[PDB]
Structure formats: C-alpha cells, structure tokens
Amino acid sequence: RAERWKAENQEGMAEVARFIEMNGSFADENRDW
Amino acid sequence: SQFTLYKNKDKSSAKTYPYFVDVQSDLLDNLNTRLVIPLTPIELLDKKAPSHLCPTIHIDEGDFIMLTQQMTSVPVKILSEPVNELSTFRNEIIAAIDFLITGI
Amino acid sequence: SQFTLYKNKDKSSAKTYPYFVDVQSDLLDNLNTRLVIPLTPIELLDKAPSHLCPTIHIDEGDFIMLTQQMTSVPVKILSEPVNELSTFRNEIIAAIDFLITGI
C-alpha cells in the first residue's frame, strides 16, 4: 500500500515543505554547481 | 520520477551539466524537492573519473559521466524537461551512491 | 571525518541550519567536495516523517536531520568541526537508504 503510506505521510511532508519555503533551503544556498 | 533523465534548463550550468538524473524514491514524490545527480559529457573531461563512483552512461544524448559526488537536492520545479529514462542503470546508480557513503 | 559535525558558516542559512554533518566516505576524501546533510533546531520545527528525518540529540541541542536537503558542498566550507555523530551513523545512513529506496 505505497499509496496509503504517501497518504498517511502527506501532512508530515507538507509541513516540512512549508517550513523550508518559510525558512529557506540549505541545498540551494550551498550547492556546488 | 526515479531514474528519469532531465535536460538542464539553466544556461549557466548546462554546458558542464547538460542533464541530471532523478535518484529519489517514487515513494517520496510528494516532496517538492528531488535528490538528483548531474551528468557531464566525456568530451569535456580532463582526467578519468573513478568508474565505481562515477559510472559511464551511454545514451542517445551521448556518453556521459555520472558525477555522483555532486548529488544534490533541487526544487522539483527544475525537473521541467524529461528527455530519457535510465532505469536499466538502476543497480549501478544505486551502487554508486552507496559507494559514496560507505566506500563499498 | 565522515559523521563529523560542522558549524554552518554560511550567514544566509546559519539561523535555520546551524550545523551540517558530513556523510561522505573517508575513502573518498581526495575529492574536493563533500556530501553533507543539514540540521535544524527541533523547537524551530512544529513532526516530520521520522524515517526520512532522524532526530539528533547532542550537546549542541536537539535537531532534525533534513535528509531531503542533502547536498554536495565545496570541501572549503567545512571550516569549523565541533562534534561528531558516529553514534547515530546507522540512523543517518538509513535515512539516505530510505530517501533512495523507500525502504
């Protein structure tokens, strides 16, 4: 039930995404190319 | 999508890094970022790259070295032009990443 | 120096990401770049998927490792080593496994 796993963890991921949008991304600011 | 190859739309880095391959599990496709690895043309190389870490990838677009050590997280937005699929290289791509973090 | 903890000297990201950990094999230390994963204060984040974002309890504080923000950086920015996370090596690598295999 890979789809159910995605469904269950949707809010967890969304929260993290909103966190990175509101606080900036480490990768983008430190990426070497 | 995992192992899908994308054309680098960034003019500043497109020359050295013409393409990048998505190496992130499809299970996590709800993320708005993707772990990707850039490919560089063999015709631009000064020296040979260690093949265990940087496998040679032969495709329609040409022959490339997968610069595994330069794997990075990028916004899903830049995955705008898929051009190929590298699922047949799955095992070596994974083994390359595993080598990078284990030395095995 | 795999699993060595570094203080973030990048001013534009230091507040959200005060530290990052080197996850690259010591066998490949001849490379001029390093694969690293940033840490963010847990009290600064309000419950990420545990399998993807391990919790780090260290002397510096309590952090979430943002595996999804893993990136290659110039070896130059590893200027300030302050600790090491070898005790969490399996949790750290497992998170990468998960990122790539979904297992």
From Swiss-Prot, chain A:
<comment type="similarity">
    <text>Belongs to the CcdA antitoxin family.</text>
</comment>
<comment type="function">
    <text>Antitoxin component of a type II toxin-antitoxin (TA) system which inhibits the post-segregational killing (PSK) of plasmid-free cells, also referred to as a plasmid addiction system. Binds to and blocks the activity of CcdB; will also remove bound CcdB protein from the CcdB-GyrA complex by forming a CcdA-CcdB complex, a process termed rejuvenation. Functions as a transcriptional corepressor for the ccdAB operon, repression also requires CcdB.</text>
</comment>
<protein>
    <recommendedName>
        <fullName>Antitoxin CcdA</fullName>
    </recommendedName>
</protein>
<comment type="subunit">
    <text>Homodimer in solution and when bound to DNA. Forms a complex with toxin CcdB; the CcdA-CcdB(2) trimer is sufficient for rejuvenation, whereas maximal operon repression occurs with CcdA(2)CcdB(2).</text>
</comment>
